[PDB]
Amino acid sequence: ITGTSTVGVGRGVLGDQKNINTTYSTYYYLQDNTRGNGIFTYDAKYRTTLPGSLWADADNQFFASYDAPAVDAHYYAGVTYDYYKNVHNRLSYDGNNAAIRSSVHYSQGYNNAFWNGSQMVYGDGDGQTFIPLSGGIDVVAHELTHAVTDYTAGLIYQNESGAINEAISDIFGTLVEFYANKNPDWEIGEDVYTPGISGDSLRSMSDPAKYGDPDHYSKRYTGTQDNGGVHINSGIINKAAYLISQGGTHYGVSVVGIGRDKLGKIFYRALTQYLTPTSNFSQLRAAAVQSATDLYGSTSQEVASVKQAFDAVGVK
Ligand SMILES: CC(C)C[C@H](NC(=O)[C@H](Cc1ccccc1)NP(=O)(O)CNC(=O)OCc1ccccc1)C(=O)O
Numbered sequence: 368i369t370g371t372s373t374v375g376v377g378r379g380v381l382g383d384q385k386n387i388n389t390t391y392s393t394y395y396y397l398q399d400n401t402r403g404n405g406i407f408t409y410d411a412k413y414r415t416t417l418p419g420s421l422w423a424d425a426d427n428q429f430f431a432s433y434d435a436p437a438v439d440a441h442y443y444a445g446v447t448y449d450y451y452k453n454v455h456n457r458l459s460y461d462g463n464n465a466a467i468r469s470s471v472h473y474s475q476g477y478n479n480a481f482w483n484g485s486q487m488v489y490g491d492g493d494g495q496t497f498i499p500l501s502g503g504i505d506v507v508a509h510e511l512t513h514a515v516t517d518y519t520a521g522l523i524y525q526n527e528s529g530a531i532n533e534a535i536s537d538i539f540g541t542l543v544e545f546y547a548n549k550n551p552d553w554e555i556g557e558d559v560y561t562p563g564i565s566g567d568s569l570r571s572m573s574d575p576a577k578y579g580d581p582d583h584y585s586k587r588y589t590g591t592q593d594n595g596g597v598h599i600n601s602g603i604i605n606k607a608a609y610l611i612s613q614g615g616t617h618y619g620v621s622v623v624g625i626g627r628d629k630l631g632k633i634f635y636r637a638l639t640q641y642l643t644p645t646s647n648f649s650q651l652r653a654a655a656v657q658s659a660t661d662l663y664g665s666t667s668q669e670v671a672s673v674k675q676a677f678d679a680v681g682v683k
C-alpha cells in the first residue's frame with residue numbers, strides 16, 4: 368500500500384519485545400519499506416486462502432496474543448533479508464529485491480510452515496507439537512531459503528536433490544540463527560517445538576540420529592514417504608555441514624572445523640554457481656569442493672575439510 372514508513376512495537380511468540388517496520392495509511396500495516404521492494408505480512412485468519420489480508424492495526428502497537436505470530440514473521444523476514452544482503456550480497460530471494468510476503472494464522476492447529484511457490488505460510492501449531500511456527504528464526508530463514516533455492520539451483524523436491532534442498536534450508540536457517548545471535552545452536556525448530564518438553568527439537572544438525580535421521584549415507588532412507596525422505600536424508604548433509612564448520616571425528620573420520628562463516632560462503636557458492644535441479648549427494652560434494660577451491664585455493668585447509676566431512680558421512 369502507498370503510505371509513510373513508521374515504526375511500531377509489539378511482542379513476538381516467545382514474549383520478547385521488538386520494533387517492527389510498518390506503513391501508515393489510515394491503518395498501520397505490516398509493510399516494511401526499508402528492505403528491498405518491501406516485506407509484507409498477511410493475516411490468513413485461520414483459513415487456507417492465501418495470502419489473506421495485509422495485516423492492519425489501528426495504533427501501531429502489536430501486543431495482542433493474536434498479533435505475536437505476525438510480529439515474528441515480519442521481524443524474522445527482515446533479519447533473514449539482512450543476512451543474505453549483508454553476508455552474501457544477495458538482494459531478496461530472487462537477487463533483485465522481490466517483495467517478500469508471509470501469511471500467518473494459516474488453517475487451524477496447523478503443525479507446519481512452507482513456501483508455496485510465491486510466499487511463506489505459517490501455521491499456529493496445535494499448542495502441543497508446535498506453537499506458532501514463525502516464532503523460530505531458524506524456521507523463518509528455512510522457509511525464505513526455499514525461495515532462494517527455487518530461484519537458483521532449483522533442486523527438485525524429491526529423493527537426493529530434495530534432501531539437499533532441505534539441508535540447504537536447515538543450514539541457512541541455522542546460519543541466520545547465529546547471525547541474529549539469540550540462543551543460537553545447531554538444532555532445528557527448538558524454539559517452537561513441543562512447548563511442554565524442554566531441550567528437544569525437530570531435527571539436529573550436530574547429531575541427526577538423536578531424532579532418528581541418518582548421519583551416514585549407508586543409513587539413507589529410500590522409500591517413498593516424505594517425498595523420498597527429504598526431511599530424513601537431509602541429516603546426512605546437515606551432519607556434513609556441521610562437521611565442516613565445527614569439526615569432529617565421526618565413524619572414525621576426523622574433520623578439521625573451519626567455522627560458520629566459511630561454511631556459509633562455500634555452500635552459498637555451491638547453491639548459486641554449481642548445483643542444478645537434479646544434483647545428487649555426490650554432485651553436491653563436488654560442487655562444495657569446487658566452491659571451496661574457488662574461494663580458498665586447491666591446497667587450502669578449507670578444501671581438505673570439505674573432503675573430510677563428506678568422507679565422514681559416506682558420500683564420495
Ligand atoms: C513436522 C514438520 C514441521 C516437519 C517438516 N517441515 C519442515 O521441516 C519445515 C518447517 C520447519 C519446522 C521446524 C524447523 C524448520 C522448519 N517445512 P517445509 O518448508 O520443509 C514443508 N515443505 C512443504 O510443505 O513442501 C511441500 C510443498 C508445499 C507447497 C508448494 C510446493 C511444495 C515436514 O513438512 O515434514
Ligand SMILES: [Ca+2]
Nearest residue numbers: 424426428429
Ligand atoms: Ca494494536
Ligand SMILES: [Ca+2]
Nearest residue numbers: 549550551552
Ligand atoms: Ca536456538
Ligand SMILES: [Ca+2]
Nearest residue numbers: 505554555556
Ligand atoms: Ca535452532
Ligand SMILES: [Ca+2]
Nearest residue numbers: 560561562564
Ligand atoms: Ca520443546
Ligand SMILES: [Zn+2]
Nearest residue numbers: 509513533536
Ligand atoms: Zn523445508
